[PDB]
Antibody
């Protein structure tokens, strides 16, 4: 049993997005499919249920209009379209299959989930700033004003890891910011080079920032 | 129908017997399931019909209760058991889920290691000025950070980011950043970040002029 959902989705406010859930490994039309919403670090919220055999739907009233469930039996796929997207719609949306006897509405099979981030920001590379002190010394790197997530941070091309802390990004404005620290022996710095390497896939940028006294 | 788990977070030690409760607003007649979820992954069904363990789910897990009170019990809590747990009723639609109970591992208390950093010359050229303060490897997770500029407390312009419990040493770390314009940053002289943590009566204070 496999429930395949597409990767991260970036959508503009006011637009609509159609989230697919490709099923395989079982007779698609013999099991109902449901959708669940989960906001960053929050609880699970049930959206609705659809019978793939007759297309019949049952919704959590809260999402009427906001979400529309459909299926394409000929292609063993279920879909959920979310419309008039706003900031409150940003979350991970999962499809989940019910048992043959749908009455027992629990979910043993889930899709990996699709993150839908609603923003009007345009792709923007991060500015990378060195953080220098001012027998262990802590150094850092501030990565700010980038979009969308994520960014990859390493130290000395990945040779340093034990003493590193890279923090979860946070939405400062409509742009993200994150920081990373690294702690090393006082005898290795500044006597030896310490550099943070920052990559941002979205804008195909790669930056190396040596930390200097 | 609503399901309330009450316990939002629980500190546990390996081998402990943890109990997570879930109360239904009305009789749900054993139509309740429990799920386990770890960061970045989808929920995993552990129990259905209030007491039936799903295949693969270790014997450590078990469920009980009835009517409106249900419980999830973990006998010898193992590291692999650290996660968030959710109950869900399916006696009536809409289906509803509890808020989730997150378990965290207990360890020795540890004071945070605090470091403060003035804005880099590179950022100043951009017209911005971020003062950064790292509070690393502390326990328990509860901590408060206060920023002061020339003695006055500053709330606006502060962005905080917290790591999840470290899987290697069970500690927590925090990063706090105060961002101002270059002009404002240059108007003041003394910058301080103060951390209040149970491991010290006096706040840990790092500052610079």
């Amino acid at each position: 049993v496999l429930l395949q959902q597409s990767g991260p989705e970036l959508v503009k406010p006011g637009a609509s997005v159609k989230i697919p859930c490709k099923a395989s490994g079982y007779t698609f039309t013999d099991y109902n499919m449901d959708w669940v919403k989960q906001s960053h670090g929050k609880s699970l919220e049930w959206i609705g249920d659809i019978n793939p055999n007759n297309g019949g739907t049952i919704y959590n009233q809260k999402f009427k209009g906001k979400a529309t469930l459909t299926v394409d039996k000929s292609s063993s796929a279920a879909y959920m379209e979310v419309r008039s997207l706003t900031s409150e719609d940003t979350a991970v949306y999962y499809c989940a299959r019910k048992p043959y006897y749908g009455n027992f509405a629990w979910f043993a099979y889930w899709g990996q989930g699709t993150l839908v981030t609603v923003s009007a920001a345009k792709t923007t590379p991060p500015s990378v700033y060195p953080l220098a002190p001012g027998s262990m010394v802590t150094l850092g790197c501030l990565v700010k004003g980038y979009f969308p997530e994520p960014v990859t941070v390493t130290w000395n091309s990945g040779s340093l890891s034990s003493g590193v802390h890279t923090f979860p990004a946070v939405l400062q404005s409509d742009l993200y910011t994150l920081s990373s620290s690294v702690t090393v022996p006082s005898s290795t710095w500044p006597s030896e080079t310490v550099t943070c390497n920052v990559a941002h896939p979205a804008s195909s940028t790669k930056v190396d920032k040596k930390i200097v006294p | 129908i609503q399901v309330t788990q009450s316990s939002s977070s629980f500190s546990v030690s390996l081998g402990d017997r943890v109990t997570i409760t879930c109360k239904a607003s009305e009789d749900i007649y054993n139509r309740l399931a429990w799920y386990q979820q770890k960061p970045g992954n989808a929920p995993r069904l552990l129990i259905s019909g209030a007491t039936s363990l799903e295949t693969g789910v270790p014997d450590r897990f078990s469920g009980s209760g009835s009517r409106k009170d249900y419980t999830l019990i973990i006998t010898s809590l193992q590291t692999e058991d650290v996660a968030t747990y959710y109950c869900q009723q399916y006696w009536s639609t809409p289906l509803t889920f509890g808020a989730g109970t997150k378990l965290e591992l207990k360890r020795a208390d540890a004071a945070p290691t605090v470091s403060i950093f003035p804005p880099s010359s590179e950022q100043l050229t951009s017209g911005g000025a971020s003062v950064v303060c790292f509070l690393n490897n502390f326990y328990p997770k509860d901590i408060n950070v206060k920023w002061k500029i020339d003695g006055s407390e500053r709330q606006n312009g502060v962005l905080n980011s917290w790591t999840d419990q470290d899987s290697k040493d069970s500690t927590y770390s925090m990063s706090s950043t105060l961002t101002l314009t270059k002009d404002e940053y240059e108007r003041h002289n003394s910058y301080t970040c103060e951390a209040t943590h149970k491991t010290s009566t006096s706040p840990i204070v790092k500052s610079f002029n």
